[PDB]
Design a protein around this ligand. Structure first.
Ligand SMILES: CN(CCO)Cc1cc(N)ccc1Cl
Ligand SMILES: CN(CCO)Cc1cc(N)ccc1Cl
Lengths: 300, 237
């Protein structure tokens, strides 16, 4: 189990850790989060009480360093930092645990939700989407735009997701215009899987990461990316059977976890209806279709 | 964006553009089989690609052989149209290629955009106008070349004959749309109007009769009466 120490909590903030969250009052004696499960990426995120504009947060993996949060009163946000002095970190953490100033990562034993949402997500790939290589953790917020959004403006602060565009020369082989546009298998299997992602795990990892940035930060370009990666699979007549089964599990847990009250903004009616009811894979996502129909039948 | 009432005059400026109409590409007769089921028989079609400024009609004849062994022919027909239009643009010198292609039906947008990916600078546009280009097969000489074709074939007609020697392209296009609208509403009556006077002939190299200015005004008036008429006969007014 690992720990993220918080210097202090000078401003009132709602703090999220993965799918959990709690309210910290201005100058309440909050000094961090303990018992964080090793073996997964995690995200610690923030919404100030005074300005619900800008949710923001940090993707991290506790195996890659000792990390802590400290409010910066000049830049006005809770910043993640790395402490390199490991003795000084264990010491601080131990003092705050002894004084019981930390909340415990509240995972129920039966519960594999976070695993299921992050199964293919790897800190190395996150750091390539979010470029800032002097840190081992990655900052994301509500307002960051994607490389593709910037093609349609600060490149350093962008989400470098894999560009997917169904009406592009990359997607469409000369002489197979109709075939490749109506059945995207070439684009999925040869261009994207064999060419760019190398395997389906890296593909699913980016898909899962885009969903999570969409959900936790309301990052609109991440939502676009998540839906595009779903649609590319659903619009392909030829998909490995193992990918279809895994996709159904991935989407199931995403739909399960989504706040009911956010379904109106984070779920694209056209893509979901197409994917569940018109696409080649309309019959291949049994779990996802069942949960969608029972939880958001309005959308369909 | 879309072409409509408000930006009608753009059609007659000096930026090359083409209208593409796919409504006569896939054509069938529907008939009963010996068993009493229904089947279709394809007949020759055409793509109607028109430069509204000059009257250039690039008439691509679609021979029934292109459908042989194919499924989902109404969807294929849109992609075949897009394939032939793209081929036409590629065949043209750069300085004759259109800057915009306006499709008369929205279902052509994606097929044509995909086929024209190589031409990112050609704008593919829909239109809110209900243009009567489906009636092009009521022009006798166009129908005749389509039905006689035994292979795929491109034919070139000025659909305005020599009208631009005397009138503007705006006026020429209005006349054409009026004639086609009339032929679409009541072909027999429209054709009666155009041909009732044996002394006014169609030149071998023309599609329409050689009316004087004064006779065209009369023709045009008769075509508007017809269209208004049929509209009563249809709606009981
Ligand atoms: C509150 N702590 C202890 C200060 O005495 C500040 C801090 C400094 C480092 N270096 C690491 C974590 C924290 Cl949380
Ligand atoms: C009349 N000429 C053709 C002669 O072969 C000009 C023309 C060129 C294209 N491309 C279409 C229609 C016409 Cl009418």
């Amino acid at each position: 189990m690992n720990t993220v120490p918080f210097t202090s909590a000078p401003i009132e903030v709602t703090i999220g850790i993965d799918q959990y969250s709690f309210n910290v009052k201005e100058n309440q004696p909050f000094h961090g989060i303990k018992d964080i499960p090793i073996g997964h990426v995690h995200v610690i995120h923030f919404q100030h009480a005074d300005n619900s504009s800008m949710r923001y947060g940090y993707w991290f993996d506790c195996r890659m360093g000792n990390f802590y949060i400290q409010y910066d009163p000049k830049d006005g946000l809770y910043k993640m930092m790395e402490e390199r002095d490991g003795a000084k970190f264990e010491n601080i953490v131990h003092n705050f645990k002894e004084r019981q100033m930390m909340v415990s990562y509240p995972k129920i034993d039966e519960d594999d939700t976070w695993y299921n949402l992050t199964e293919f997500v790897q800190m190395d790939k996150i750091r390539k989407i979010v470029r800032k290589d002097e840190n081992q953790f990655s900052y994301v917020d509500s307002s960051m735009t994607t490389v593709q959004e910037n093609e349609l403006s600060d490149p350093a602060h962008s989400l470098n997701y894999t560009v997917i565009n169904f009406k592009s020369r990359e997607a469409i082989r000369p002489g197979h215009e109709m075939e490749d546009f109506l059945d995207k298998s070439y684009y999925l299997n040869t261009v994207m899987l064999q060419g760019i992602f190398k395997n389906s795990s890296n593909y699913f990892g980016e898909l899962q990461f885009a969903f999570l940035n969409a959900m936790f930060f309301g990052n609109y370009g991440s939502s676009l990316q998540w839906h595009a990666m779903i649609e590319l699979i659903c619009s392909s007549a030829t998909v490995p059977k193992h990918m279809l089964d895994k996709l159904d599990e991935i989407l199931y847990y995403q739909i399960k976890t989504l706040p009911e009250q956010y379904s109106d903004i984070l779920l694209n009616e056209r893509v979901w209806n197409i994917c569940l009811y018109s696409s080649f894979q309309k019959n291949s996502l049994h779990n996802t279709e069942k949960i969608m129909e029972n939880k958001y039948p309005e959308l369909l | 964006g879309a072409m409509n009432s408000s930006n009608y005059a753009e059609l007659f400026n000096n930026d090359i553009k083409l209208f593409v109409d796919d409504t006569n590409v896939y054509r069938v007769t529907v008939h009963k089989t010996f068993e009493g089921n229904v089947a279709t028989k394809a007949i020759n079609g055409c793509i109607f690609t028109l430069n509204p400024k000059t009257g250039h009609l690039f008439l691509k004849i679609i021979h029934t052989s292109v459908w042989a062994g194919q499924k989902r022919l109404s969807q294929l027909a849109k992609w075949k149209t897009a394939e032939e239009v793209s081929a036409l643009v590629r065949s043209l010198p750069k300085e004759e290629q259109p800057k915009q292609i306006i499709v008369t039906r929205k279902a052509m947008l994606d097929p044509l955009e995909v086929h024209m990916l190589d031409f990112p600078n050609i704008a593919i546009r829909p239109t809110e106008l209900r243009l009567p280009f489906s009636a092009a097969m009521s022009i006798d000489k166009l129908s005749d070349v389509v039905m006689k074709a035994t292979e795929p074939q491109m034919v070139l007609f000025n659909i305005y004959d020599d009208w631009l020697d005397r009138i503007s392209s705006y006026t020429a296009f209005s006349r054409l749309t009026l004639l086609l609208r009339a032929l679409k509403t009541n072909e027999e009556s429209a054709k009666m109007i155009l041909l009732s006077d044996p002394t006014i002939t169609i030149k071998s190299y023309h599609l329409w009769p050689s009316f004087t200015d004064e006779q065209w005004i009369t023709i045009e008036s008769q075509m508007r009466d017809l269209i208004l008429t049929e509209y009563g006969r249809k709606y009981n007014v």
